[PDB]
């Protein structure tokens, strides 16, 4: 388990509204929140809080830099026959989709793409050549306990779970890719018909297969905002996610954790959590909420 935080810069709208930037990342593992506060007598002061992560990225960090220290180290895990998961977590507008899917739009500039790029590079390496693996991709979203295939026109799928308890998503479409350009075509397609704005869970998968068997799988997840009572399903999934990840380094189930169940139960499984933060003073309470959730996640490492 690896936990990171990424601060996005203030955008045009926020700068125009003269939003104050209350986030500092003085080192590669330290993030500071300059929380505005008032004493009882109305005196203004700062309660500067400190959080430490495996990696803390500032507003000047590009997606490639973020990718290098988060999902990149997990690709090898699937070639070694494991199951990896990378989650983008945070408030609405914090940068989750921008990081995983591309800037906004541009698939190539996102983690899904970059990860794919390294998967093709590794499979062609001598240590793996003799694996004779085939690369497959899937893209689906979870909305109100329902699974929808984004590569099969939002087709609603069924999720079943025997007694042995493994889960299976009936009908999910797996597409064969042999080139990064292939993957970029499936990402554009999927993102084009996704339910920008959260409301769902996005999950783009990269599977490795050899002979009827699954060699390894990497599930990249673009979570829904963490901050119409569907927020109950979102909060239950996030609560469920936390306990599943913590159970990895040692419920009250939800769809998300049910579908990704097999990626937390194995002994050869790794995960990375990236906490996105919007730097504005107006989002300070949302930030603290994101950071404290993150603390408890890494708390199991």
């Amino acid at each position: 388990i690896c936990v990171c935080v990424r601060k996005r810069p203030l955008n045009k709208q926020e700068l125009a509204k003269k939003e104050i930037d209350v986030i500092s990342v003085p080192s590669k593992c330290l993030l500071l929140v300059h929380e505005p506060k008032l004493k009882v007598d109305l005196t203004k002061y700062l309660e500067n809080q400190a959080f430490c992560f495996d990696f803390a990225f500032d507003e000047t960090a590009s997606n490639e830099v973020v990718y290098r220290f988060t999902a990149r180290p997990l690709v090898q895990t699937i070639f070694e026959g494991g199951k990896a998961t990378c989650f983008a977590y945070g408030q609405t507008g914090s940068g989750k989709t921008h990081t995983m899917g591309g800037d906004l739009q541009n698939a190539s500039k996102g983690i899904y793409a970059m990860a794919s790029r390294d998967v093709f590079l590794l499979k062609n390496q001598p240590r793996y050549r003799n694996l004779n693996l085939e690369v497959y991709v899937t893209f689906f979203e979870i909305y109100n306990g329902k699974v929808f295939d984004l590569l099969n026109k939002k087709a609603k799928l069924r999720v079943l779970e025997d007694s042995r308890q493994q889960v299976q998503v009936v009908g999910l479409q797996e597409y064969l890719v042999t080139c990064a350009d292939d993957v970029i075509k499936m990402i554009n397609m999927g993102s084009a018909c996704r339910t920008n704005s959260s409301r769902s869970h996005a999950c783009f998968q990269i599977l490795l297969r050899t002979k009827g068997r699954l060699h390894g799988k990497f599930s990249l997840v673009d979570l829904a905002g963490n901050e119409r009572m569907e927020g109950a399903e979102i909060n239950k999934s996030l609560l469920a996610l936390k306990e599943c990840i913590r159970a990895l380094g040692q419920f009250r189930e939800s769809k998300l954790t049910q579908v990704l169940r097999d990626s937390f139960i194995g002994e050869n499984s790794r995960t990375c959590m990236i906490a996105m933060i919007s730097p504005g003073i107006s989002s300070c309470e949302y930030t603290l909420n994101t950071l404290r959730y993150a603390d408890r996640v890494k708390e199991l490492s």
């Binding site: 506060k37 008032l38 004493k39 009882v40 007598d41 109305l42 963490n226 901050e227 119409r228 009572m229 927020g231 109950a232 909060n235 239950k236 609560l239 309470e285 949302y286 603290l288 909420n289």
Partner: protein, 421 residues
């Protein structure tokens, strides 16, 4: 000039039901109808009747229905009694959003129907429960909107802080924290009443093994009477709201003054010096805690009955000689003393007797924050596991609003402690 009373939800309703009855007895208004000064609270309607300037709202009939039943039935207008069929369910999220929305427009409009026959209104006195369905939810929403329709006009809340024994609900602490957050930037001054403190006073004093609501309310009635009184009689103590609060709250952070009632003694004369002496006694407070610990940043003495200042003075002198004065650094030594010659009338079949003279003492101490802690702990500890949160997310609330609210209570508890020397 004028003055609207609003009672929302069971506790709110029943409390007011009992202090609108002490009001009548004080001003001698035979339930039926008739008998300025008395005008601060009543509107001389028809060529007989006297009727209150109040509005009662609950999200189920039940409570209000008993009002349109027992005598006093005639006392109000049918309109000032709003009722709502579907219950609040016991969760702010319902009262503030789901079930409230539906009745807010009808209440909001009627209270404005009341304020319309008031040449220069003053503000609203609002009575509601802390935890409790619509007491927390609807109240919060009312206040938000009252602030929109009535800019200046002050808002004085009379809140009921919940206590384990006079039965609460498991989720109570959530509700309390929740309302007190939204509601805080919109009230001017609020009077908290600990149900444990009143249950307590009814035991040590009235000597009731099983204190009823109807038993508690009667006592609360009295505390409230003594609080308003000043601005009902009229030329006496705390005249025209404003100068009431300008006296207790030094900081915008809505400060909740601590109330202490004088001599409570069962039916079936106490010295002026003695009742004052009983005012600086923890066992007689309105919110269980103790100021021999914290500090005072504004003291108030509100007497009623036969009293000359000559004594009130010598009682204060000796009340400081062998006592825990403990006044705070940057603030005089208050003691805005107010005497209201009009004697303390009590309910006829009541449990308390007529008394020659009674005191009130409203103090804004830092030790009142000891109650903001007792609540946070309960909340914090349940929230540690999303204990019941899902019922709120269910009506359409954000898990964030739970953080964002406790987040303020963390802050308030800081401010309170920060005022110390």
């Amino acid at each position: 000039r004028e003055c609207i009373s609003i009672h929302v939800g069971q506790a709110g309703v029943q409390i007011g039901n009992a202090c609108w009855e002490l009001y009548c007895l004080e001003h001698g208004i035979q339930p039926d109808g008739q008998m300025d000064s008395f005008n601060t609270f009543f509107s001389e309607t028809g060529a007989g009747k006297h009727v209150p300037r109040a509005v009662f709202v609950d999200l189920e009939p039940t409570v209000i229905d008993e009002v349109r039943t027992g005598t006093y039935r005639q006392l109000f207008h049918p309109e000032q009694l709003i009722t709502g069929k579907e219950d609040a369910a016991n969760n702010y999220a319902r009262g503030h959003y789901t079930i409230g929305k539906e009745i807010i427009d009808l209440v909001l409009d009627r209270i404005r129907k009341l304020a319309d026959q008031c040449t220069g209104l003053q503000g609203f006195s609002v009575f509601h429960s802390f935890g409790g369905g619509t007491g927390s939810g609807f109240t919060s929403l009312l206040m938000e909107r009252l602030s929109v329709d009535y800019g200046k006009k002050s808002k004085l809340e009379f809140s009921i802080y919940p206590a384990p024994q006079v039965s609460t609900a498991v989720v109570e602490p959530y509700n309390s924290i929740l309302t007190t957050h939204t509601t805080l930037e919109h009230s001017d001054c609020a009077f908290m009443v600990d149900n444990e403190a009143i249950y307590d006073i009814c035991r040590r004093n009235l000597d009731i093994e099983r204190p009823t609501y109807t038993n508690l309310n009667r006592l609360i009635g009295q505390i409230v009477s003594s609080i308003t009184a000043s601005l009902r009689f009229d030329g006496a103590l705390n005249v025209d709201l404003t100068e009431f609060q300008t006296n207790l709250v030094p900081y915008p952070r809505i400060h909740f003054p601590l109330a202490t009632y004088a001599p409570v003694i069962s039916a079936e004369q106490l010295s002026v010096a003695e009742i004052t002496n009983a005012c600086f006694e923890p066992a007689n407070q309105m919110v269980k805690c103790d100021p021999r610990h914290g500090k005072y940043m504004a003291c108030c003495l509100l007497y009623r009955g036969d009293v000359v200042p000559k004594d009130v003075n010598a009682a204060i002198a000796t009340i400081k000689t062998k006592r825990t004065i403990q006044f705070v650094d940057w603030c005089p030594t208050g003691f805005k003393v107010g005497i209201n010659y009009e004697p303390p009338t009590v309910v006829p079949g009541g449990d308390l007797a007529k008394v020659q003279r009674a005191v009130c003492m409203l103090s804004n101490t830092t030790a009142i924050a000891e109650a903001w802690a007792r609540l946070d702990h309960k909340f914090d500890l349940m929230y540690a596991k999303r204990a019941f949160v899902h019922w709120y997310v269910g009506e359409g609330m954000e898990e964030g609003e739970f953080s964002e609210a406790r987040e303020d209570m963390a802050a308030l508890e800081k401010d309170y402690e920060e005022v110390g020397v």
